[PDB]
Structures are given as structure tokens and as C-alpha cells.
Design a protein around this ligand. Sequence first.
Ligand SMILES: [Br-]
Ligand SMILES: [Br-]
Ligand SMILES: [Br-]
Ligand SMILES: [Zn+2]
Ligand SMILES: [Zn+2]
Ligand SMILES: [Zn+2]
Ligand SMILES: [Zn+2]
Ligand SMILES: [Zn+2]
Ligand SMILES: [Zn+2]
Ligand SMILES: [Zn+2]
Ligand SMILES: [Zn+2]
Ligand SMILES: [Zn+2]
Lengths: 141, 141, 141
Amino acid sequence: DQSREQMASDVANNKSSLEDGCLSCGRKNPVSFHPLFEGGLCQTCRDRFLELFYMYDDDGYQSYCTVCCEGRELLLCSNTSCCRCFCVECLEVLVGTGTAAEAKLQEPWSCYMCLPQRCHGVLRRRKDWNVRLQAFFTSDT
Amino acid sequence: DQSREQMASDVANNKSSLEDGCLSCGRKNPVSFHPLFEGGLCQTCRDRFLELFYMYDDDGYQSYCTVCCEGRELLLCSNTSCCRCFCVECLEVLVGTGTAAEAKLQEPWSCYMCLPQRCHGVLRRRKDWNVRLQAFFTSDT
Amino acid sequence: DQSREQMASDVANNKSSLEDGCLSCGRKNPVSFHPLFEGGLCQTCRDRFLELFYMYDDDGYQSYCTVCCEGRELLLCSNTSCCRCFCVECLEVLVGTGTAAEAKLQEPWSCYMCLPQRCHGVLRRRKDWNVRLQAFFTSDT
Ligand SMILES: [Br-]
Ligand SMILES: [Br-]
Ligand SMILES: [Br-]
Ligand SMILES: [Zn+2]
Ligand SMILES: [Zn+2]
Ligand SMILES: [Zn+2]
Ligand SMILES: [Zn+2]
Ligand SMILES: [Zn+2]
Ligand SMILES: [Zn+2]
Ligand SMILES: [Zn+2]
Ligand SMILES: [Zn+2]
Ligand SMILES: [Zn+2]
């Protein structure tokens, strides 16, 4: 089974497209797409987002990583219009080693949806993220 | 058992949080959140929005209250890019006594999603309403 | 009004409203609305969008016509923030004869969701398309 470290390395070296790996778990030939970041989304990782219990914590931050839906070791966007979260693992594997530690020291921290810069490592916000999100909500499938 | 009048009074006097009452019906400890306004949303009030038949009337205005999903005594946003509706009861209870009558005299009336001002009484548009609405559409539970 | 050619002609010459025909197939008295363009949407044409499997082709353009969901002869929006598609038939019948041929030679082509001009033939982008699309995603029926 393709690790996320292997997927990130192949993407950076133009061996695979982001679209042919699950951005969340690393597996090959996912059925669907992550709507916010360049990358596929497998059926299992897509169902995690749909099947969350509480989507927010008691402080009004999201209870889940925007990329992989993990709830542990979340970095919290300081933009009160956003309140999205990214996990340590996604920062380490998609942006690069040390990103998580650097981000935990930033005061305030702005997430990868809020940053003007579109790409960091193989974490690339979609140019068409808004239309992609509309497409993601359109399908029953 | 908790009335909406009791919930609004406790919120204004910092006795309870908007998030621990249903903004639509007043019930304590709702399961989810109203996506547009600060406030909880119970399972049954959430199901009203999901189970609407016709969402628009013959004049192109929404057939339901943005807060509680009621069809009776709707005020109609005059912004042709919006066409959302708010009922008399939600205005009276969340904004305050006389709001509906004051709104009927406005030349023209702009709804609480269109007004630059975020808060009126305990009706507070979310700073993160757009991300909250994306979270609301993501959930299949 | 039965064929799409008949519906377009009646609309242009003030015999019918766009809202009383299916924008996708031409059928009279459709149950719902097209969320992006003025026009009804019948149950069958609405179900095409809900039952899409792949929303995107291998080049990151949408796999379906924005208006009718079929097409096969898709024109591709050149805006990398959009990547929507419109079929030859929808352009010929809603905008007018020659539109498809003109659009295939245009370098680059901007689709009817991107163009500043709201109206071309009987194709009118909704003033409230964003709120209409939120209403479209709200219904679980
Ligand atoms: Br694999
Ligand atoms: Br949306
Ligand atoms: Br509940
Ligand atoms: Zn996955
Ligand atoms: Zn993550
Ligand atoms: Zn953010
Ligand atoms: Zn309720
Ligand atoms: Zn109401
Ligand atoms: Zn409004
Ligand atoms: Zn139809
Ligand atoms: Zn078409
Ligand atoms: Zn476009």
C-alpha cells in the first residue's frame, strides 16, 4: 500500500499526478477528489468527512483536519472567518519536515486556505476550489 | 421545555451560550449548529430544512424562514441577489419586540444576511458563515 | 414548451416564462429550478446532476454540461478558477445558431458563469445564483 511519504516524493518528482493518489491516506487510484487541495480522495477518506459526529469543538474551531479528517494534534487557523484546522502529519508529509513545529510557534497562524501563496511543498490549494466544492456537494454518489 | 424568549433573555445576560440552545425552536443541548447565525440546531429543526418541498414561491423568494424554516408571516429581502426570508416570530424573539413592524416600514428592507452590521439583539450572523455552510453541506448524518 | 427550440422561441417572444420550462430538456411545468441560470429543472434532468459519478475529466475540466449534464461536444472555460463546460446543443438552442462555432474559434473562451454580461439569448445567469445553489444543496429530497 502506497504510503503518504512515497506519494509526496513521486508527486514532487513528476512520477505521479496528485489526482491519482488519495491526499488523505496515500492510496493509489482514488474514486473522487479533495475539493480544496490538489489530490484525489478515496471512498473511505471521503466518508470520514460525511460521517463526522461534532464538526466543531466548544471554542468554534473545526474538530477535524481539512486534508485527512484526523482530530488529534490540530493547528487552529486564527482567522475568525475560517476556523479550519490542519494536523501535524499533513504539514510534515505534504509541506515538509519541521513545518508543524514552525507553525505551532507562529502567533498568529494562518492556515493554507487563508495564505495568499497557493502552494507549499505538494500542498497546492486548487485554483478552482470554490467550483470544486460546488461539484463535491452536487453529487449524491 | 425552554421557550425561545427564555433562551434569548439568558443569552443577552450571559447566563447561556447561543450554541447550547436551538436558534429555531429554543430547545436545550441541540446536536448541531445553525450554519448562518450563532446558535445550535436540533435534529428535528435541521430535518425541516433538508425535507422542504418547494424552496421558492412563484415570485422567486424563498418559501421558508432562514432561522426556523416556517412559511408563515415571512419578510422578504429586497436584494435581488439574496431573496432570503425571515419570519415575524424570529424577528420579535431574537432581535426584539417591534422589529417586525419596524422592518415592514423600511424603504426597502435588507435581511440579516445582507446588512453590514453582523448582530441585532441575539441574532448574530456567524463571522465564519461560509465555512460553516460548507461544513453543514459536507455532513451526511 | 415541448422541444427546446419551441421553449427558447416562446421565451424570447414573451409567450412563456423561463421558470415554466426545463432549461435542460424543454419540458413544460418542471418540479424544480436550475440553480445557476433562469429556467426550471424537471425531475429527470435534476437526477442527471445528482447521479454524476466522475465530475472531472483527466485534464481538470468538468465532465458535464453546466445546463443539461450531457453534451459530449463540450466547450471548456479557459478560466483556471472555473473549468466549467457548456455543450454545443445548449449554446445553439439557448444563445443562438452559430454561438458554438464562434466559441470553438475563440482564444481564449470564457463561459457564461465567468462573463460580466448576465444575458445571452434566453441564457440568463441568476442574480441570486449563489443563494439558489445553497438552496439546491440544502434539500435532501
Ligand atoms: Br495503494
Ligand atoms: Br457552496
Ligand atoms: Br437534538
Ligand atoms: Zn484515502
Ligand atoms: Zn491531516
Ligand atoms: Zn484559515
Ligand atoms: Zn430545534
Ligand atoms: Zn423564523
Ligand atoms: Zn438578504
Ligand atoms: Zn428536463
Ligand atoms: Zn448542454
Ligand atoms: Zn467559466
